[PDB]
């Protein structure tokens, strides 16, 4: 009875399949893939952020030169300068007039915002998708368990053992190269660590926040201070993190395909509705009811009464139930034409009980399996009027 | 010092204080960590790890360790004791067989446990040598200053002691250790709980139909499978393990060097080990074509070396490499 | 490797002790009757069939699990590296990770 | 599967939860004596070494 089932990847709607175990009473499913969070394999390549030209205070030798050296600070720009007369609080102070030397030095450093407000590149591989699958199973009526997709993983949470996927729809909405910012995720071809052109994205490129080493192509060019005054002309491109916040591109949670949402959290891409998942469950046999205890319902009749050719469960149909005992009777349309809101219907001794459903074909000729009794609920449906609210329960469009 | 039911206690199933649980022949260094139900170490009070407290009666006996014997197929070597627990260097053995000598009696305890000692390495010795390379074995410590794990050690349940149930010249007479809590009634109807000093028994007479119990939970125990539960509660008593498995580099194995012999793109190797040695290679083409064989019998072997190279692993001796153009 | 770190069984002396499925990993527990448990004074429970014994055992990580342990992985492709030396030209040195 | 590799399956070392298919089957102790027959496959980590 290990109920294999191909199953559409779509998040917010149950998939009430039916266990046709030969010998005992069938049992309905209710498989709602409440989430499709993905979490691909990734690598933190480098944080970037806007620089801060945290200038070390220049040297001023008063009569003669002060040769600079290339200190190992990131992008340590330093250039000796002569021909000053530095006004500092008493007019000038160095008594020479051309031998007055000024050595300006400036290096690039991570902002304090780099720790917290920072873009973040990644080389993104495929990884392994997940889900908090609820099944309000059978008469169990509950399990809300986190699972995987790889087609040999069980998750014995509740009582049922369930194996999912691998899904066929391998579209990772993440591209190979991704930039990430706070919550807005950008599938951007970041240039690389160690290379980013100044002004362009990644002018600062630190491996992480702690990493004292980095790559700072900022085109930081010191110029001589003017007219014998102490200061430090640092001529520099404002960061490619400054832009990339107001001349950027749009976020993947606003431009992705096939229906995904995003988080700066394990780097999941939630709820990506695409393709199918070959899902298979091993039910606990204890949860089964033996066949000789559920009422046999045959010699019945089914008919629509007001079929709504729609998404919400507007389709209805009375069923002239013709039972033997009285009790519950799980139901399902093995044809995917009709999706039913009721998993189970209570029965007195051969009464009648309408259920709700939804279809996509004008003439819904769908079988209905009322606990081992098939029936065609043939009829005709009506279009609605009022179509602006969230996503459907029908999801069965085909040739009609 | 807990007391439990040893399985083949010299004759048969006694109740030894040194009842052996949790034999662990899972390391490599000839060592086993064992738990006696007896807590040797310091005395009852405060002194000298190298003394010896087991249970005799309801009571301890915190005295000298004089003549401990762990043993297996051969007599083992003690390594160190701490708490309920002893580490001892043993050879392989189908069983484990423990015992001290109080002085009047042998008073040992024995148990089944599959033991082996593979050293880490492609040499399958039976015993650690004096020499050879060092490499990362798994092994237990000598020491006690240890917290890497802790096992639950809550209370004892009751225990039987029919030395209590004397006779009051016609009635069966219970007493108490020190005011301890004796849980008492008989098959007949008389006092039904028992939380008392020395009681008598109005109704029953026979010692063999009464509840000689000792709720004496002033000192916790190890939670042996051979313990009856203290039904009241999960009392406290989280307690460490001394002998953590650690990443010691055992003084370890080494197999005698090979005899390299040249042929045309072929290594003849007359070979002659000390012990069964797992040899293996990797023809470094994208065609791997590896080989594995434990060698204990000296054997001249062959290896079709290719143009680009092969490598060669004479046991945990380092891997060789070879240009065969 | 596991360690069957047995919790110490219950022994009710006259009548049953129903076990429950505690949430320990692989919590195996089975009530048993028909005992007469020799514990240091001969038996101690005065009944002879109503003597009940409830054995319980769960699986737990060894202490070696922390240190001596196999380790599975789902392995993707990632990105290869090298400490490329170039004793370049007349530069004659750089040993860099790339 | 018990005996096979991964009879114990813990996410990490800290993870108190795990999966232990060891086929651990307790049997009744013998002849009125206190002990705990635990009948179990030695691990698929014992083999695999």
Short mmCIF file of N, CA and C in Angstrom, two decimals, chain B residues 2-5 15 22 24 26-27 57 138 140 149 158 160 162 187 211 213 223-229 245-247, chain C residues 1 3-11 13 38-46 56 58 61-64 66-68:
data_model
loop_
_atom_site.label_atom_id
_atom_site.label_comp_id
_atom_site.label_asym_id
_atom_site.label_seq_id
_atom_site.Cartn_x
_atom_site.Cartn_y
_atom_site.Cartn_z
N UNK B 2 27.64 0.72 43.88
CA UNK B 2 26.42 -0.02 43.62
C UNK B 2 26.71 -1.51 43.58
N UNK B 3 25.69 -2.31 43.87
CA UNK B 3 25.76 -3.75 43.77
C UNK B 3 24.66 -4.28 42.86
N UNK B 4 25.05 -5.13 41.92
CA UNK B 4 24.15 -5.67 40.91
C UNK B 4 24.45 -7.15 40.74
N UNK B 5 23.83 -7.74 39.72
CA UNK B 5 23.84 -9.19 39.53
C UNK B 5 24.87 -9.56 38.47
N UNK B 15 25.40 -11.78 43.10
CA UNK B 15 25.22 -10.34 43.14
C UNK B 15 26.54 -9.75 43.62
N UNK B 22 28.55 -2.20 30.65
CA UNK B 22 29.14 -1.27 29.68
C UNK B 22 30.64 -1.53 29.48
N UNK B 24 33.54 -1.66 26.89
CA UNK B 24 33.78 -0.85 25.70
C UNK B 24 35.15 -1.18 25.13
N UNK B 26 36.07 -0.63 22.22
CA UNK B 26 35.80 0.13 21.02
C UNK B 26 36.95 1.02 20.61
N UNK B 27 37.93 1.21 21.48
CA UNK B 27 39.12 1.98 21.16
C UNK B 27 40.13 1.06 20.47
N UNK B 57 27.36 -6.14 52.50
CA UNK B 57 26.14 -5.91 53.24
C UNK B 57 25.32 -4.83 52.55
N UNK B 138 42.18 6.24 18.39
CA UNK B 138 41.15 6.53 19.37
C UNK B 138 41.46 5.76 20.64
N UNK B 140 41.34 6.16 25.34
CA UNK B 140 40.86 6.80 26.55
C UNK B 140 42.01 7.37 27.36
N UNK B 149 31.71 14.30 28.79
CA UNK B 149 30.36 13.77 28.84
C UNK B 149 29.97 13.56 30.29
N UNK B 158 14.95 0.67 46.09
CA UNK B 158 15.17 -0.11 47.29
C UNK B 158 16.10 -1.28 47.00
N UNK B 160 16.78 -5.51 48.72
CA UNK B 160 16.40 -6.52 49.70
C UNK B 160 17.44 -6.59 50.80
N UNK B 162 17.10 -9.32 54.02
CA UNK B 162 16.38 -10.16 54.95
C UNK B 162 17.16 -10.43 56.22
N UNK B 187 2.44 -10.69 53.38
CA UNK B 187 1.29 -11.17 52.63
C UNK B 187 0.02 -11.05 53.45
N UNK B 211 8.25 -7.81 53.37
CA UNK B 211 8.90 -6.81 52.52
C UNK B 211 10.12 -6.25 53.25
N UNK B 213 12.91 -4.17 52.78
CA UNK B 213 13.30 -3.16 51.81
C UNK B 213 14.15 -2.10 52.49
N UNK B 223 22.95 4.29 36.90
CA UNK B 223 21.65 3.83 36.44
C UNK B 223 21.82 2.55 35.62
N UNK B 224 22.32 1.54 36.32
CA UNK B 224 22.53 0.24 35.72
C UNK B 224 21.21 -0.35 35.26
N UNK B 225 21.28 -1.14 34.19
CA UNK B 225 20.14 -1.98 33.85
C UNK B 225 19.83 -2.98 34.93
N UNK B 226 20.83 -3.34 35.73
CA UNK B 226 20.64 -4.27 36.83
C UNK B 226 20.32 -3.56 38.14
N UNK B 227 19.69 -2.40 38.05
CA UNK B 227 19.14 -1.63 39.14
C UNK B 227 17.62 -1.71 39.13
N UNK B 228 16.97 -1.87 40.28
CA UNK B 228 15.53 -1.58 40.33
C UNK B 228 15.29 -0.09 40.49
N UNK B 229 14.32 0.41 39.73
CA UNK B 229 14.00 1.83 39.74
C UNK B 229 13.65 2.30 41.14
N UNK B 245 36.77 9.15 25.35
CA UNK B 245 37.63 8.76 24.23
C UNK B 245 38.24 10.00 23.59
N UNK B 246 39.57 10.00 23.49
CA UNK B 246 40.32 11.15 23.02
C UNK B 246 41.15 10.77 21.82
N UNK B 247 41.63 11.80 21.12
CA UNK B 247 42.38 11.63 19.89
C UNK B 247 43.87 11.58 20.21
N UNK C 1 28.38 4.18 16.39
CA UNK C 1 27.77 3.02 17.00
C UNK C 1 26.93 3.45 18.17
N UNK C 3 24.78 3.14 21.80
CA UNK C 3 25.00 2.53 23.10
C UNK C 3 23.64 2.31 23.73
N UNK C 4 23.30 1.05 23.96
CA UNK C 4 22.04 0.69 24.59
C UNK C 4 22.15 1.04 26.07
N UNK C 5 22.06 2.34 26.35
CA UNK C 5 22.20 2.84 27.71
C UNK C 5 20.85 2.65 28.40
N UNK C 6 20.65 1.42 28.85
CA UNK C 6 19.40 0.94 29.43
C UNK C 6 19.01 1.78 30.64
N UNK C 7 17.83 2.39 30.67
CA UNK C 7 17.30 2.85 31.95
C UNK C 7 16.86 1.68 32.79
N UNK C 8 17.05 1.83 34.08
CA UNK C 8 16.94 0.73 35.00
C UNK C 8 15.49 0.25 35.11
N UNK C 9 15.20 -1.02 34.86
CA UNK C 9 13.81 -1.45 34.74
C UNK C 9 13.03 -1.32 36.03
N UNK C 10 11.73 -1.20 35.87
CA UNK C 10 10.80 -1.22 36.99
C UNK C 10 10.50 -2.66 37.33
N UNK C 11 10.29 -2.90 38.62
CA UNK C 11 9.85 -4.19 39.12
C UNK C 11 8.74 -3.94 40.12
N UNK C 13 5.90 -5.58 42.35
CA UNK C 13 5.97 -6.88 42.99
C UNK C 13 4.69 -7.68 42.87
N UNK C 38 15.70 -12.56 41.91
CA UNK C 38 16.77 -12.70 42.88
C UNK C 38 17.61 -11.44 42.92
N UNK C 39 17.55 -10.71 44.03
CA UNK C 39 18.32 -9.49 44.21
C UNK C 39 18.85 -9.47 45.64
N UNK C 40 20.00 -10.11 45.85
CA UNK C 40 20.82 -9.97 47.05
C UNK C 40 20.24 -10.63 48.31
N UNK C 41 18.99 -11.07 48.27
CA UNK C 41 18.36 -11.71 49.41
C UNK C 41 17.52 -12.86 48.93
N UNK C 42 17.97 -13.50 47.86
CA UNK C 42 17.05 -14.28 47.07
C UNK C 42 16.11 -13.32 46.37
N UNK C 43 14.92 -13.80 46.05
CA UNK C 43 13.91 -12.90 45.52
C UNK C 43 13.52 -11.88 46.59
N UNK C 44 12.75 -10.87 46.18
CA UNK C 44 12.27 -9.89 47.13
C UNK C 44 10.78 -9.60 46.99
N UNK C 45 10.23 -9.75 45.79
CA UNK C 45 8.80 -9.58 45.60
C UNK C 45 8.08 -10.86 46.01
N UNK C 46 7.12 -10.74 46.92
CA UNK C 46 6.57 -11.91 47.59
C UNK C 46 5.56 -12.67 46.75
N UNK C 56 12.89 -1.33 29.83
CA UNK C 56 12.90 -0.23 28.89
C UNK C 56 14.33 0.05 28.48
N UNK C 58 16.47 2.55 25.40
CA UNK C 58 16.52 3.43 24.25
C UNK C 58 17.94 3.49 23.72
N UNK C 61 23.58 8.03 21.37
CA UNK C 61 24.90 8.22 20.82
C UNK C 61 25.96 7.76 21.81
N UNK C 62 26.95 7.03 21.30
CA UNK C 62 28.10 6.71 22.12
C UNK C 62 28.85 7.97 22.50
N UNK C 63 29.75 7.83 23.45
CA UNK C 63 30.70 8.90 23.70
C UNK C 63 31.67 9.01 22.54
N UNK C 64 31.91 7.90 21.84
CA UNK C 64 32.74 7.93 20.65
C UNK C 64 32.06 8.63 19.49
N UNK C 66 30.94 11.49 19.35
CA UNK C 66 31.45 12.85 19.24
C UNK C 66 32.72 12.89 18.41
N UNK C 67 33.52 11.84 18.46
CA UNK C 67 34.91 11.89 18.05
C UNK C 67 35.23 10.85 16.99
N UNK C 68 34.77 9.62 17.18
CA UNK C 68 34.97 8.52 16.25
C UNK C 68 33.62 8.25 15.62
#
